[PDB]
């Protein structure tokens, strides 16, 4: 179609058609069926927790966790729980599945039975999910690998055809997306751009990232960046970057227009914003991330069921914050059971 983004030809189909190693293929069932199941195991635990809270006359600690509780209650009371009646599992069937689901079934086995403990404050959700780096592997899991691959693939296209590209990654964390990007853009550790600014809210990640990304360490710079705050005030050079990568982070901010405006301050006009985001809430994500305070960062501006936005919503937000909107959307899967995407947008001069 000759569609271009950031000056290179790319299409949704070009990215979405890529098939990559995923545990669901290897386990191996179809994504839509598994999505039914990975989410299927969660529905059981959600239902149990809601039933247990109510029967025991318990209420959650009076903080963000009540929002989590509300979502689980609605999931059950809306009748959505029963529909998920359609899939019945004996307690034998349930555990038998989970052993096969690698990272995902495993978070369910970890977190599912701890829902009441988290709600009532007997279990520290973050510490709990982080043990054995389970949270970090969740990012590496099949759940988000395809969207990360979309991003890496676009970065490769960009860096292979254009030289001296400057990249900044927001919320790089332990480098799950980064690792995919670097592996495609610099398969042999060769220099491939003029700058890769590795950033996160917390510098605590940087040490492990350097080790994880050792093959590329001399090409990476590391700096703290709270994207909720003015980037210039944080020692960054405004409007110098050609590509910004933000995987699974932008939603975790308090006010999306403020965050996007800050992203804009970093990009050159014509610069590309690579946004990797979940497209919608699923019970599994509610279970997995809903227990964490960061999930509820947007409640004050109405993101009260989850921090997430649909692609259409991101499109509008982008247009209001100096971007072109969604130039390209690539989804992990086709149909209703899709849950993640890459959104590419172009920074526009406000002048
Ligand atoms: N306000 C903020 N500014 C910059 N980073 C933030 C942030 N709030 C949360 N983050 C970071 O965003 C990351 C989200 S987890 C995503 C990790 C990685 N991008 C991946 O996809 O695999 C965390 O490391 C967290 O520290």
Q: How far is CA 209 from the centre of its chain?
A: 18
Is 246 near ligand 1, meaning CB less than 6 Å away? no
Please state whether the peptide bond connecting residue 28 to the residue before it is cis, i.e. omega within 30 degrees of 0.
Answer: yes
The method recorded for this entry reads X-ray
Last residue of a domain, one of 72, 102, 131: 131
Please, what is the angle between helix 91-98 and helix 31-55, to 10°? 130
Same domain? For 112 and 162 the reply is: no
**Centroid of ligand 1 to alpha carbon of 197 (angstroms):** 14
Q: Name the domain boundary from 131, 147, 181.
A: 131
Sign of the alpha-carbon dihedral angle for 40, 44, 47, 53: negative
Same domain, 85 and 166: no
Same domain, 150 and 241: yes
Burial of 132 from C-beta contacts in 10 A (0-12 / 13-18 / 19+): exposed
d(CA 120, CA 341): 34
Strand 328-331 and strand 195-200: the pairing is unpaired
Give the C-alpha separation, 315 to 311, whole Å. 6
User: What's the rounded Cα separation, in Å, for the pair 46 and 116?
Assistant: 10
The whole-angstrom separation of Cα 150 and Cα 156 is 10
Same domain, 340 and 219: yes
Pair 180, 288 in one domain: yes
Same-domain check for residues 194 and 232: yes
Q: Are residues 142 and 286 in the same domain?
A: yes
Q: Which domain holds residue 323?
A: 1-24+132-351
Same domain, 64 and 2: no
| 293 and 255 assigned to the same domain | yes
CB-facing half-sphere around the CA of 71: CA atoms within 13 A: 26
Number of domains forming the structure of the chain: 2
**195 in the same domain as 139:** yes
Domain-ending residue, one of 82, 113, 131? 131
- State the Cα–Cα distance between residues 121 and 217, nearest whole angstrom: 40
231 in contact with ligand 1, CB cutoff 6 A: no
Q: Does residue 326 line the site of ligand 1, with CB under 6 A?
A: no
Structure's resolution in angstroms: 2.0
291 with 182, same domain: the answer is yes
The answer to whether residues 285 and 243 belong to one domain is: yes
Query: Of the candidates 277, 276, 273, 297, which has an alpha carbon nearest to the alpha carbon of residue 285?
Result: 277
d(CA 110, CA 41): 12
Q: Is the CB of 177 under 6 A from ligand 1?
A: yes
Residue 238, SS3 per DSSP: coil
| Nearest residue (CA) to ligand 1, atom 12 | 171
Q: Is 226 in the pocket of ligand 1 (CB under 6 A)?
A: yes
């Amino acid at each position: 179609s000759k569609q271009t983004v950031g000056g290179v030809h790319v299409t949704p189909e070009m990215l979405e058609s890529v098939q990559i190693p995923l545990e669901a293929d290897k386990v191996g069932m179809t994504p839509a069926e598994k999505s039914k199941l990975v989410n299927a195991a969660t529905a059981v635990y959600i239902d149990m927790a809601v039933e247990e809270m109510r029967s025991r006359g318990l209420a959650p600690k009076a903080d963000y966790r009540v929002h989590w509780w509300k979502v689980m209650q609605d999931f059950v009371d809306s009748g959505e729980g029963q529909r998920v009646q359609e899939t019945s599992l004996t307690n034998q069937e349930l555990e038998r599945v989970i052993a096969k689901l690698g990272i995902e079934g495993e978070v369910i086995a970890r977190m599912g039975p701890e829902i009441v403990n988290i709600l009532t404050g007997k279990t520290h959700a973050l510490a709990h999910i982080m043990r054995d780096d389970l949270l970090f592997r969740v990012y590496l899991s099949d759940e988000g690998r395809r969207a990360n691959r979309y991003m890496a693939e676009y970065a490769r296209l960009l860096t292979s055809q254009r030289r001296d590209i400057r990249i900044l990654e927001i919320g790089a964390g332990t480098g799950g997306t980064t690792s995919e990007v670097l592996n495609l853009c610099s398969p042999n550790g060769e220099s491939f751009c003029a700058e890769y600014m590795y950033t996160d809210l917390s510098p605590g990640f940087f040490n492990a990232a350097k080790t994880t990304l050792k093959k590329w360490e001399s090409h990476l710079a590391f700096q703290v960046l709270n994207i909720e705050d003015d980037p210039a005030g944080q020692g960054f050079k405004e409007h110098t970057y050609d590509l910004i990568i933000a995987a699974n982070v932008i939603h975790a901010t308090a006010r999306l227009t403020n965050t996007l405006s800050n992203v804009h301050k970093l990009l050159k006009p014509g610069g590309v914003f690579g946004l990797v985001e979940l497209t919608r809430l699923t019970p599994f994500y509610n279970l997995t991330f809903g227990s964490l305070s960061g999930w509820w960062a947007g409640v004050d501006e109405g993101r009260t069921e989850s921090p997430l936005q649909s692609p259409q919503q991101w499109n509008s937000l982008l247009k209001q914050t100096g971007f072109s909107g969604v130039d390209l959307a690539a989804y992990d899967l086709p149909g209703p059971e899709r849950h993640s995407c890459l959104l590419l947008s172009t920074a526009l001069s406000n002048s």
